[PDB]
């Protein structure tokens, strides 16, 4: 219906942006956990091989010499070397189905109602590459270091947001809930881009 009172803007809008599921944690929690393991083309786990500097086969004479019972020396018990069931680079990256990917995302609007679901503009008048007076625009809603991300969808000069960690752009189709939920009030914005099945920002 209404997206609560909108500051500076007449109001917001009434788009579908998915049936409007409730949440069902189970699902998103998986895609989320699954998201923290995507760009994993590879991963160290360097230190390995049960065949360390094994510059030799058993030279300790088995029967006799008193207490003994040695053998090789990549021996998992020998303080010398040998790390057991070694280790490995692996993949990590689990893959979430396609449908499960789009399932339950922007549940933000309804729940985070009195917080996030704002739609305005991508700030068109912003200088060539200027972040300094971002504050002027960072105050049209009074959402600053509170975090928030924009979803204008135009790799224009608005990628200006550079800071320890406050405003992030990524204004484009490419965007996962992980980010949408990492910020206080993801300024959807974009306008019209937020259609039905393609509410992709």
């Amino acid at each position: 219906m209404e997206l609560v009172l909108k500051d500076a803007q007449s109001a917001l809008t009434v788009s579908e942006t998915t049936f409007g599921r409730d949440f069902n944690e189970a699902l998103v929690h998986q895609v989320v956990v699954a998201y923290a393991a995507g760009a994993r083309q590879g991963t160290r786990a360097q230190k390995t091989r049960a065949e360390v500097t094994g510059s030799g086969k058993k030279p300790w004479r088995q029967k006799g010499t008193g207490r003994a019972r040695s053998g090789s020396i990549k021996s998992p018990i020998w303080r010398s070397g040998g790390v057991t069931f070694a280790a490995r680079p692996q993949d990590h990256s689990q893959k979430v189905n396609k449908k499960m990917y789009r399932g339950a995302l922007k549940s933000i609007l309804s729940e985070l109602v009195r917080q996030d679901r704002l739609i305005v503009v991508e700030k068109f008048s912003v200088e060539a590459p200027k972040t300094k007076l971002l504050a002027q625009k960072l105050k049209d809603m009074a959402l600053e270091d509170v975090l928030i991300i924009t979803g204008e969808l135009d790799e224009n000069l608005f990628l200006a947001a550079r800071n320890l960690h406050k405003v992030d752009v990524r204004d484009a189709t490419g965007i996962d809930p992980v980010s949408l939920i990492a910020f206080d009030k993801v300024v959807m914005t974009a306008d019209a881009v937020k259609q039905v099945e393609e509410m992709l920002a």
């Binding site: 069902n24 929690h29 989320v32 509170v146 990492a182």
Partner: protein, 144 residues
């Protein structure tokens, strides 16, 4: 109104809860409670791929001759759809969406199956009583 008693409380994301049950047998290792052992604990097959007792023999008894229908597969054309995503020119060869023969093939022969026509110059070479008597609200044809 924002209260200056110092902490926001809007509603953005932070996160989005979760997807189902089961996210770790508890492996990645063994260490911790229960002191696992694996190599299933006994002392027989330790490293995998030790399908001791090949599935073959003792299961591998008696093996009838056989061959292969060189028919590609002669897909039936289909679930009694002919005519309607069937190009509505009713005949049949290949460029279809809802029900398609997929093209690589010799012949068809349609069974009758799902819901039929309302219009249908049925060809497809093909047959069946399922066909002659259900598709028959329209266009017989068979040709060769």
């Amino acid at each position: 109104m924002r209260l200056n008693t110092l902490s926001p409380a809007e509603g953005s994301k932070k996160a989005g809860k979760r997807l189902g049950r089961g996210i770790g047998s508890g492996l990645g290792k063994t260490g911790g409670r229960g002191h696992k052992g694996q190599k299933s604990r006994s002392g027989g097959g330790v490293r995998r791929g030790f399908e001791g007792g090949q599935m073959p023999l003792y299961r591998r008894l008696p093996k009838f001759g056989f061959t292969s229908r060189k028919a590609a597969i002669t897909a039936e054309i289909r679930l009694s759809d002919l005519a309607k995503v069937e190009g509505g020119v009713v005949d049949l060869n290949t460029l279809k969406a809802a029900n398609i023969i997929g093209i690589q093939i010799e012949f068809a022969k349609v069974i009758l199956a799902g819901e039929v026509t309302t219009p249908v110059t049925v060809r497809g070479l093909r047959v069946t009583k399922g066909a002659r008597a259900a598709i028959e609200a329209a266009g017989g044809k068979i040709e060769e």
